[PDB]
Amino acid sequence: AATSRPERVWPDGVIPFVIGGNFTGSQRAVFRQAMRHWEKHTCVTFLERTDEDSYIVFTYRPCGCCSYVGRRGGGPQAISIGKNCDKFGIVVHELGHVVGFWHEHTRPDRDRHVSIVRENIQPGQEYNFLKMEPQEVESLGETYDFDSIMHYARNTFSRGIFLDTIVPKYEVNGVKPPIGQRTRLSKGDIAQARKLYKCPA
Numbered sequence: 001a002a003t004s005r006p007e008r009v010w011p012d013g014v015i016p017f018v019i020g021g022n023f024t025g026s027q028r029a030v031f032r033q034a035m036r037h038w039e040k041h042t043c044v045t046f047l048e049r050t051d052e053d054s055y056i057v058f059t060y061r062p063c064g065c066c067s068y069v070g071r072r073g074g075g076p077q078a079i080s081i082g083k084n085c086d087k088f089g090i091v092v093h094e095l096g097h098v099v100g101f102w103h104e105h106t107r108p109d110r111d112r113h114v115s116i117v118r119e120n121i122q123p124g125q126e127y128n129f130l131k132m133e134p135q136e137v138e139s140l141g142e143t144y145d146f147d148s149i150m151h152y153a154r155n156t157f158s159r160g161i162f163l164d165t166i167v168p169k170y171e172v173n174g175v176k177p178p179i180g181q182r183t184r185l186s187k188g189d190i191a192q193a194r195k196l197y198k199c200p201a
């Protein structure tokens with residue numbers, strides 16, 4: 001679910017950043033690890049912010065919907081890191097939003113690949129499952145990626161332990177594809193980010 005908006009692509013892949021106060025060193029290390037993970041696999045780079053108008057701020061506060069997708073023009077955009085959303089996988093996901101990805105399960109073609117069970121979503125979190133209108137996404141020829149760090153698990157924001165919010169429609173290698181199990185960028189994430197940022201080979 002790569003943004004179709006050219007103005008939301010960080011120019012030259014440069015993403016200036018500030019880390020707010022109140023984080024432990026341990027938490028700051030996670031941010032660096034997640035940023036490095038993106039840097040190592042794509043041409044995106046994270047720079048300590050000096051005087052740039054647009055930049056990201058890792059902000060110590062309760063977890064909550066909803067993060068800005070891509071570069072917000074003209075002022076900073078906060079990433080909410082709280083006690084329950086400060087692990088590597090979640091930060092890598094949130095940085096995916098920053099670089100310009102919506103959730104994979106909200107791709108315009110998503111009903112070909114999964115079913116959303118809206119009844120099972122926690123009230124106030126349905127924003128995270130709402131299908132993107134087709135003009136808002138340009139997938140760059142890449143197919144629906146069940147392995148994406150931007151794809152939720154079967155029960156992400158579910159109302160109960162044994163209830164699914166997302167159910168894949170079909171089998172891949174004999175089973176329904178595992179979703180939302182990985183905590184690292186997928187092959188598909190990397191390929192697509194490389195096209196989005198026009199990275200050299």
Ligand SMILES: CN(C)Cc1noc([C@@H](CCCC2CCCCC2)CC(=O)NO)n1
Pocket residue numbers: 063067084085089090093094097128148149150151152153156157179180181182183
């Ligand atoms: C308390 N809190 C942990 C609940 C929660 N459930 O989802 C989320 C965020 C995305 C989870 C990314 C995860 C990465 C690994 C693969 C599966 C998906 C909310 C969100 O979309 N933030 O941008 N918070």
Ligand SMILES: [Zn+2]
Pocket residue numbers: 093094097103
């Ligand atoms: Zn998200």
Ligand SMILES: [Zn+2]
Pocket residue numbers: 001002104142143144145148188189192
């Ligand atoms: Zn994708």
